Amino acid sequence: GSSGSSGKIMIAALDYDPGDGQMGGQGKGRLALRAGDVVMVYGPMDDQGFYYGELGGHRGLVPAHLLDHMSLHGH
Template sequence: METRLELDVLIYPDEVRVATPEDVRDWELETASQVSIPTVRLFVALYPYNPAAMSPNPETAAEELPFVPGQIIKVFGDTDADGFYHGMSLMPSLSDVASIPDDVVVRRMVALFDYDPWESSPNMDSEVELGFRSGDIIYVLGNMDQDGFYYGDLHGRRGLVPSNFLQPLPWE
C-alpha cells in the first residue's frame, strides 16, 4: 500500500519551508481580498432583443448579444454603468435553427385569429408554417415575403405566418 503525503510549501529566494496551517490561512485571507469571484446567474429571455434595431447605444450594438424568447443566457456580475450585464448564450434556444442576421428588424404582432396551417394553409409545404391562436404575440423577423407571409417566432418556435392574420403591437 502506497502512502502519500501532501504538503504546502513556501518558496522564498533564499529558502523553501513547509507551510504551517497559520501560513496557509494568512495566504488565503490575503488573496481573498485581492481576488473577486464574479456572481454568475442564469436568465431566460422573455422577449426578443435585436441590438441592430433596438440598442440604445448604436455605436456599440455589434458588441451586444441578440436573443429570442426562451433562450438561456449566462450572466456574470452586476450591470455596468449603462445598465447592461456581461453575458453569453449558454445554449441556443430551440428556435435558433435559423439565426437572425444583425440587421433584421424585429416587430411585435398580435394574432387576430386562430391559424392551423394543416387546415387553412394555401401552401403545399404547411410544415414550415407556424400555428397560433388568437391573442398570441408573435415576433416577426424581417419583411413580408411575396406570398404575404412573415417569418415569425412564437415561444421559441419559428415558421412562416400569414400577414393577414396579424396586427402590429407596439413595444411597451
C-alpha cells in the first residue's frame, strides 16, 4: 500500500535546558525542551539514548527519557 509514518510526535514531560553546559564538540549540542513542547523526532535513538528532532526550527539531539509518548484521544 502506501508507506508513511514520517517522523514521530512527542512532548517534553519536563523542561530540558541543555544550554547550560552543552556538549564539547564533534557535533552539536542538544535542544532545549519545555514542559508541554510538542517536538517532532525521526528514526530511532543513539547509544546515549537521544532522539533526532527539532523544536522551533532548530534541529538537534533530544532526550528519549524526558519526552512522553502521546496517546490517541477521542470524543
